[PDB]
Design a protein around this ligand. Sequence first.
Ligand SMILES: *[C@@H]1O[C@H](CO)[C@@H](O)[C@H](O)[C@H]1NC(C)=O
Lengths: 85, 85, 450, 204, 51, 51
Amino acid sequence: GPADCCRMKECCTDRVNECLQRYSGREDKFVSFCYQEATVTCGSFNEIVGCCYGYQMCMIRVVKPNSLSGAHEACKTVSCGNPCA
Amino acid sequence: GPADCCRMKECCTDRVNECLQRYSGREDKFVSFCYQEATVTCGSFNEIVGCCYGYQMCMIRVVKPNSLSGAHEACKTVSCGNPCA
Amino acid sequence: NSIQIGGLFPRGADQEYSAFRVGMVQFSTSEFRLTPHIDNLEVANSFAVTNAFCSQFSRGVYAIFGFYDKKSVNTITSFCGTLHVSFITPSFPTDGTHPFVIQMRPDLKGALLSLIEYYQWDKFAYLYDSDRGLSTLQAVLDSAAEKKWQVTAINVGNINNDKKDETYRSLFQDLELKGERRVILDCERDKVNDIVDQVITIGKHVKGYHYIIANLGFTDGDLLKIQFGGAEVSGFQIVDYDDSLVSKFIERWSTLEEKEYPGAHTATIKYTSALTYDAVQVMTEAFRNLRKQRIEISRRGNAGDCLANPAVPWGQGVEIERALKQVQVEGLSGNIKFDQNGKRINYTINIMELKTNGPRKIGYWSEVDKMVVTLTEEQKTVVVTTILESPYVMMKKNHEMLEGNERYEGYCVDLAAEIAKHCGFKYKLTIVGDGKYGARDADTKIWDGM
Amino acid sequence: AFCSQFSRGVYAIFGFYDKKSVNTITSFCGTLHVSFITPSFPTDGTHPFVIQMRPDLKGALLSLIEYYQWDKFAYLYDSDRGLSTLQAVLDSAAEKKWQVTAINVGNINNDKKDETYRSLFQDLELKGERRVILDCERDKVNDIVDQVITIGKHVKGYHYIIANLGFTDGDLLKIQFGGAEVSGFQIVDYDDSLVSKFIERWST
Amino acid sequence: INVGNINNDKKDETYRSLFQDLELKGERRVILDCERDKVNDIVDQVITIGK
Amino acid sequence: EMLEGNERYEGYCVDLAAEIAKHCGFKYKLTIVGDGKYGARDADTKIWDGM
Ligand SMILES: *[C@@H]1O[C@H](CO)[C@@H](O)[C@H](O)[C@H]1NC(C)=O
């Protein structure tokens, strides 16, 4: 049906987070993986960019092992950037 | 300075609504004008598309004179569509 | 100076009564001697508890030492509260303000939560039963809401033992589904053991799982079962055997004959029994302090019927209560002191971890300082996946006459030889099964290929 | 009181119990073979010589949650009727994908409770949760409702589920016009002819 | 809008219709010039409809 | 000479820098290396010089 922006973002963050939860304690390794899955399920306007690029980057640089919850809670409000290129 | 999505959308709807409030009874006529100004103030990833396209179309098709408040309240949750095209 | 004190021992509790008698012998003095009246009952039965309590009351006991269950505990608290008779118990601490009750067992909540924070657990599983009450559950749920924890609360107490086989397999199946490894067991030792056996049976004791046993009896049960399993296990110990007091006590305990004192011949002692011993100490010191303060608590006449309405309490009771609560002594559970309500204060809960060689204390937990840590602490053949492409990997003409990496020739083969030569490992060249490089299937979302 | 009734030689007893006293009643009625009938909450287990008038609310609640398709919500409970329902919805949350926030409102004293609720719903604002289940006695329900209206969370977008058989027993006129969805359970249908006649006699 | 001519006995839905009509225009900013009692009444009705 | 900061410099690596910083979401300040060398290890003092 119709595609959105806000919906895609909220879905993106949630799916990434829920995904990283299965990988607890190795979490810092799998961020890009879970972001890939999340981009697949939530869709993206540009396949390269993904659902939310900025959230992905913030998580990748911030996330430390077992620190997930706080990291996501800090990073989920971040600007996603341009979902074009 | 990333422009995100949601922030831009909520900004778009808010500016459109706030602008259309200034024109009473002419509300259905000035929708495109206020959408132009709102896209200007909130910025857009594609200048042609605007901040939120689906909201613009929704307002244009729904809004009738003096019906502003309800029309906006109905149209502000709608999907914006593809921001890059 | 005969001091009559009633006592309640659940049928099947031996070492507790043994340690009780040992306490009677060791803390005995020429000044005064405690004269216990022991009454065995069904602890879960409220009626039985009521009958026993009123029996002790009519006998005119100055204090009662006993046990309770989630079912019977309110009977004890209410009756002791009404008749002003002091009750001392090793059983789980009551959540609330209960007068005329002295709870020997320390509160485990703080130690547990601090332990969770120590291991940095964001998400885990909580297995509980309703025996000692849901107080701990409420605690970890409120703390889970506060600290943003995702906790799975599962009641294993309502599962019947007759029909429980596939129930636990399904339990840990659902638990494996979410990939949650970390698991906390808050249960009676029997249920714990059962769950453990189910775990080893289902092979959930392998590496990657972390179990936290919540109780003071971590070394009292058999840890040899999952010891070699390869999963981390952590827990709490209220009795330090490295202490001189506990060491000498244990020497005398081990020299005791099993025939006279049941289950008293052992290297260790259950924390409940130890708490009983320490309780005997507390009572002795209490009445001693009563005699030193020159206050006579002696009963003038018989107490009469406990049920008789309106109930009238004796005055002396309050004095005996204050006497007990003001006691501070040294014992197997460490420093023993009480607050106004009767809960334990200034306890030290040794935080212990099960390792390969055996259990070891990694730290201790205090009511103030929280968790404080004690003393800080071949070559496998590399599997090389590759695909056939020219001239990267190709089959030799004579390849049927050869075996292993000698079968393949190509750029990537030589490059593999070089990489292995520089990195210093033995390598096994293998061709990928599906014969693809790599991809994500749009349906199954599974990565295929090398 | 029970032994008083017993010595008088009564053939049956009708009464109420609490989470504390219920074991006394069950044990005594079971031992002395005296039948006990009560409106109070059902005991969880098999207890003889007790006839529980109150129906089980668990199934209705869980099925309702499934009906509204709630993935995540907040569960407000107290320690008065027991944690049985809480344990139930937690186990069912474990079976399903549910994310449940359990908060104990029972240990909060009524004299000092003002900011306790503001902080409560503050923590509820943290997660942004707009779906909330109240499992409490009518009094706590009413108090929590008043606090909800005060902080203005009874407006549209919020969904409250009151768990009890007394949904119409408390005052609903308060949040009725608030614009927020409220759902609950009723064990007494006033549309029934029997109940209608009873009410006609009752009001007089 | 004159809120003074409304009788206290029959006034329930009158305020609901008032603020509904006020919702029509989307009006948020509102000035109350009234006696303390009428002020209290209007305020309470505002809390009731959650505005 | 009339500009200041990152506006002083232009080039391939500058634009690429802008892109990297835009992608990684940080504020960057372009600076020229002191010794004016790329990088090397002195065989004697074992000290790295350069960027
Ligand atoms: C003993 O307990 C009290 C109660 O919290 C505490 O303030 C005090 O610091 C404790 N003493 C020690 C040595 O832990």
